[PDB]
Amino acid sequence: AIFRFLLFFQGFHNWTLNPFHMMGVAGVLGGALLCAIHGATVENTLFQDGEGASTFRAFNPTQAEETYSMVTANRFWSQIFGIAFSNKRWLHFFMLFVPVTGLWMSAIGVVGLALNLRSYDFISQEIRAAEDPEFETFYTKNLLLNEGIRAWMAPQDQPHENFVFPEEVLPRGNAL
Amino acid sequence: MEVNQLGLIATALFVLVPSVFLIILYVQTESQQKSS
């Protein structure tokens, strides 16, 4: 009942083309990357504070020295990605800002689709394609998918509308 | 292409303006140690 809400959006609002949703993704997707690159950096930078291999115990839940080496980490990344952290306090704030911010932009976006104030088309592209029938971009391609999603879906998805689309109306490619 | 005529400005300002705000602060910071 949600996957439906997804496609409906793609089909009527053309969400994926909205700059706000894009940020939404860039955040959720990059917040995952932080939540996984950090986790791995910590675990593979641990000092030895135990004798066995299962180094989970080596960590005294009680205070004292850092358990991994921020200094070593900062060195790794900086030579293997040019940039690297070096301020645990900033690292952990970034980790709060990234995923949080993106879901906020994600929201503003939808507040917009409430008024169907979507980011459906690029006029410059439409005007061109209306006049020149040989102009095709992945943009236009996707727009036809939407026409399809609405034509075939609408009927059973909006019953109170009593839609009736005769087979001859249904937009379709060739063969299929 | 029939693009928005104010696009070239909406993009130019959207870059320069806040971007300059940051350049000002940074440099004014450096100079609190005579730098620049």
């Binding site: 200094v71 900062n74 040019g82 940039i83 070096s86 | 693009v3 696009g7 070239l8 870059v15």
Partner: peptide, 30 residues
């Protein structure tokens, strides 16, 4: 005119990459 505007902001991200790497404030041990 757009092409140019897109290629510029891009050329800027790329020069900003150089500086952020090879012109940062070295993380000195304190």
């Amino acid at each position: 005119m757009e092409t140019i505007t897109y290629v510029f902001i891009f050329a800027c991200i790329i020069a900003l990459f150089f500086f952020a790497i090879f012109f940062r404030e070295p993380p000195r041990i304190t």
